[PDB]
Design a binder for this molecule. Sequence first.
Ligand code: HEM
Length: 110
Amino acid sequence: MVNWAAVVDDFYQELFKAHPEYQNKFGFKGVALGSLKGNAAYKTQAGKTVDYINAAIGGSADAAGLASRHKGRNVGSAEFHNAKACAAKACSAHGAPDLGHAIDDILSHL
Ligand code: HEM
């Protein structure tokens, strides 16, 4: 199976390398990037992200509900366009399909 857990790890590395301040919104605020895998808050969040990717691919994802929840953290369209670029890099690094269509579905509600 596509190793979405590894893709997601590379996604967050890309995302917080380019936009370190985004990490302040998470329960692993302030944690060194090379230590995220040892942080309990990160382990839970990355698992949720992996679950959402599998739901989007499996056809059950609630993109409107995910967008609304991100709006609820003052995360919007600009951040998701940046996420699109970071996910494209993470997917390419693993020879995984791109997640641009799933991220566009979220963007359609932002
Ligand atoms: C590929 C794009 C992204 C996906 C698939 C995604 C996925 C998720 C999921 C599945 C959750 C958990 C929602 C739930 O528990 O109901 C979540 C929470 C969250 N996301 Fe994202 N996200 C993305 C990008 C971003 C970006 C760019 C930021 C900007 C900071 C961000 C900020 C947050 C925050 C702050 C939370 C709440 C974390 C907490 O409860 O501690 N997300 N996201």
